[PDB]
Amino acid sequence: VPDKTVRWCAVSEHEATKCQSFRDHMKSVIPSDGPSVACVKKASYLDCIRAIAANEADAVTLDAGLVYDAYLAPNNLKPVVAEFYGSKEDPQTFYYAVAVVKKDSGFQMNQLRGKKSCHTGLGRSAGWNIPIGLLYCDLPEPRKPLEKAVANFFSGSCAPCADGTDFPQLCQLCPGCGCSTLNQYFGYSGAFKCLKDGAGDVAFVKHSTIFENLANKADRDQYELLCLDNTRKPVDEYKDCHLAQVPSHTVVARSMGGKEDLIWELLNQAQEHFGKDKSKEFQLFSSPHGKDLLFKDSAHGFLKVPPRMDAKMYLGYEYVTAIRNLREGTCPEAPTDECKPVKWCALSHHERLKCDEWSVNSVGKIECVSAETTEDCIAKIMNGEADAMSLDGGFVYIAGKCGLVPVLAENYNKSDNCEDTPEAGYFAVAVVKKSASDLTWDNLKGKKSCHTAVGRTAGWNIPMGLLYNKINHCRFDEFFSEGCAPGSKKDSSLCKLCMGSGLNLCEPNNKEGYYGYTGAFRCLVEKGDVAFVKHQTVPQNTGGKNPDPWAKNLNEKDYELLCLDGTRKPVEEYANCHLARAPNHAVVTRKDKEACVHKILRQQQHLFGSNVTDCSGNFCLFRSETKDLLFRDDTVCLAKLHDRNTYEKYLGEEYVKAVGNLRKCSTSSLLEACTFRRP
Ligand SMILES: *[C@@H]1O[C@H](CO)[C@@H](O)[C@H](O)[C@H]1NC(C)=O
Ligand SMILES: *[C@@H]1O[C@H](CO)[C@@H](O)[C@H](O)[C@H]1NC(C)=O
Ligand SMILES: [Fe+3]
Numbered sequence: 001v002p003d004k005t006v007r008w009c010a011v012s013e014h015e016a017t018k019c020q021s022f023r024d025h026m027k028s029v030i031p032s033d034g035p036s037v038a039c040v041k042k043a044s045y046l047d048c049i050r051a052i053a054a055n056e057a058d059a060v061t062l063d064a065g066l067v068y069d070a071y072l073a074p075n076n077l078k079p080v081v082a083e084f085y086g087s088k089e090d091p092q093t094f095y096y097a098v099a100v101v102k103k104d105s106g107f108q109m110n111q112l113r114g115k116k117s118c119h120t121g122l123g124r125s126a127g128w129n130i131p132i133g134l135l136y137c138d139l140p141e142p143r144k145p146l147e148k149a150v151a152n153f154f155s156g157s158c159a160p161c162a163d164g165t166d167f168p169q170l171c172q173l174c175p176g177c178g179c180s181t182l183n184q185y186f187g188y189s190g191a192f193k194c195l196k197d198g199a200g201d202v203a204f205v206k207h208s209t210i211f212e213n214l215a216n217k218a219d220r221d222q223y224e225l226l227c228l229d230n231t232r233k234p235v236d237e238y239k240d241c242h243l244a245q246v247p248s249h250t251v252v253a254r255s256m257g258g259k260e261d262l263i264w265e266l267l268n269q270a271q272e273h274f275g276k277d278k279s280k281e282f283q284l285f286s287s288p289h290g291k292d293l294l295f296k297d298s299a300h301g302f303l304k305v306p307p308r309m310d311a312k313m314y315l316g317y318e319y320v321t322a323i324r325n326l327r328e329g330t331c332p333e334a335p336t337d338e339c340k341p342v343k344w345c346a347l348s349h350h351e352r353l354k355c356d357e358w359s360v361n362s363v364g365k366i367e368c369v370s371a372e373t374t375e376d377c378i379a380k381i382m383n384g385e386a387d388a389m390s391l392d393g394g395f396v397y398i399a400g401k402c403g404l405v406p407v408l409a410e411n412y413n414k415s416d417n418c419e420d421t422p423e424a425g426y427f428a429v430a431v432v433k434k435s436a437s438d439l440t441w442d443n444l445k446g447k448k449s450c451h452t453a454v455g456r457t458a459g460w461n462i463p464m465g466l467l468y469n470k471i472n473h474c475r476f477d478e479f480f481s482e483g484c485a486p487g488s489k490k491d492s493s494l495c496k497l498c499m500g501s502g503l504n505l506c507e508p509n510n511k512e513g514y515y516g517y518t519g520a521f522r523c524l525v526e527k528g529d530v531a532f533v534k535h536q537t538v539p540q541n542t543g544g545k546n547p548d549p550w551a552k553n554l555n556e557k558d559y560e561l562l563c564l565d566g567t568r569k570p571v572e573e574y575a576n577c578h579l580a581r582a583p584n585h586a587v588v589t590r591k592d593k594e595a596c597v598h599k600i601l602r603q604q605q606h607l608f609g610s611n612v613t614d615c616s617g618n619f620c621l622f623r624s625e626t627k628d629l630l631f632r633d634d635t636v637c638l639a640k641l642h643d644r645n646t647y648e649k650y651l652g653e654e655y656v657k658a659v660g661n662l663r664k665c666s667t668s669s670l671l672e673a674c675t676f677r678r679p
């Protein structure tokens with residue numbers, strides 16, 4: 001009360017040597033109110049994970065594979081610090097796994113069978129665990145032992161660290177399948193030589209491996225990469241043509257106990273002091289007693305892992321999927337029919353219950369799964385637990401930084417050709433009361449505000465984007481006196497006007513009554529000085545059309561819009577008095593389901609779209625009661641997106657800019673973690 005020493009787990013005799021030498025040296029230049037280091041010794045990395053889980057140790061650095069095993073029940077560890085490997089200014093932490101090949105050898109990923117493979121080694125990420133994991137279900141039966149089936153798949157290979165007596169075929173190119181730099185084709189660089197030399201047809205390596213072996217691009221153009229869509233790309237389009245995105249070397253911590261922040265403090269203070277080129281006393285990435293003790297010797301320092309980043313996310317879908325398949329042999333029995341059912345992500349129980357009903361009517365084509373925030377749902381879509389949800393533009397943006405794709409837009413304009421008509425978008429406006437004559441778009445300092453939610457187009461990204469372009473700081477909660485912006489930090493002023501109780505207060509879901517367009521507006525009625533909503537929200541909640549007590553008798557007449565020019569006009573005059581265009585909300589998913597989601601959803605909306613009336617008794621998809629459940633209440637249909645299937649491409653060039661301009665101000669723990677993976 002308080003303890004500060006980090007109980008670091010060591011493997012070798014040698015590693016335990018440096019661990020205490022590391023402790024001694026920290027004590028020389030770090031004060032007593034800072035972190036120290038203690039050492040625990042166990043027989044292998046396997047024991048260390050067990051150690052940290054049972055709270056008899058705190059941290060250890062691991063390769064991607066062991067990171068997976070560590071996250072598993074009952075270990076439940078999570079990655080907290082990352083080694084990086086480039087310059088301080090463009091630090092490289094992850095590496096993408098790729099399958100390199102000679103230019104114009106006329107085959108794709110789905111034709112690897114019967115070709116000659118070059119690998120880095122067994123247990124290795126890019127050279128084995130990724131390719132074989134992702135090719136697992138095309139391997140011939142029996143797939144036990146894996147090595148045999150792999151041998152039976154390729155027409156000859158080099159598999160390092162494997163066994164040549166049991167399986168000879170893995171060695172035709174490495175006659176002595178040697179787990180050592182002795183054998184010429186070992187590891188990243190050797191595996192590539194294999195391909196370069198002609199031994200093999202495909203080599204499995206990092207994206208950087210080629211660049212480290214061919215400095216000149218005229219040489220690189222003689223190679224290509226195999227993309228997962230059974231197509232080829234040039235070696236410098238790794239980012240859009242890789243297998244999986246491995247992390248290099250990760251310190252992991254207890255998911256509950258920790259000590260997460262401490263671990264960072266120690267390591268950050270370590271790299272400041274004895275890191276790289278730092279001191280000539282102690283060397284954190286070098287040694288006397290053998291190499292890669294505690295950390296890799298090519299490591300240039302550390303970076304903290306954003307707290308939103310659990311292991312599933314860190315390792316990433318394609319990795320996790322890969323390494324899963326290696327252990328649990330689940331493949332379709334025998335073929336996957338055509339389109340299994342879609343997991344829609346309900347936002348807490350209000351949406352769940354609508355979802356659950358939607359499910360019943362769909363005869364097994366739509367399953368429901370809920371999370372309590374949308375970011376949580378987004379992450380669920382990323383990791384496989386979920387498949388699809390519809391999102392405000394500002395959150396499609398985030399989804400898109402997280403590598404998810406817009407599949408179909410919502411459309412709000414009545415038309416005989418609704419499904420095949422891209423709409424320019426809806427209009428973000430700023431609504432106040434006629435009664436409050438005093439207010440103007442300039443005069444807002446020290447007034448009270450109501451937002452749909454943080455990170456949404458009309459409720460945040462647009463209004464605040466502008467505000468930031470004026471005031472020049474992110475502290476919006478000080479420019480306003482107080483407000484309601486569900487998703488704000490519980491003790492900002494922008495949570496003071498929200499209406500939820502007590503944990504639910506300011507929570508960015510329907511349990512909070514000022515959430516969304518209706519909620520933002522209601523906030524304006526009861527508590528605030530200005531709502532930031534879409535252009536239709538007033539009509540939609542006045543003149544009796546919203547029957548709830550608070551809305552029953554409010555009149556359109558009673559409200560006005562603030563225009564940018566400083567003047568103010570009635571609600572219907574939004575075309576002449578809006579803040580910006582807002583990209584229509586849209587549905588998003590991951591690439592491998594874009595197909596089935598587009599198919600199922602048109603199948604689905606023809607049954608339950610705005611065509612249908614007598615919605616009571618029937619199930620009607622796009623009508624909720626004032627709460628935009630699953631979809632906005634005024635959705636007319638879902639529009640196709642031909643070649644407009646990318647968050648940048650979909651949202652357009654204006655919106656992506658404006659949101660980008662706000663990057664500095666972002667508060668979002670998911671955006672941090674996704675752009676950490678990489679922007
Ligand atoms: C709605 O449909 C009309 C019909 O021609 C079309 O011109 C327009 O793009 C759509 N949007 C608005 C705001 O009128
Ligand atoms: C409802 O409207 C759409 C619009 O053309 C139509 O395609 C669909 O078939 C209709 N509903 C049903 C249940 O078929
Ligand atoms: Fe590797």
Ligand SMILES: [Fe+3]
Pocket residue numbers: 392393456457458582585
């Ligand atoms: Fe919106």
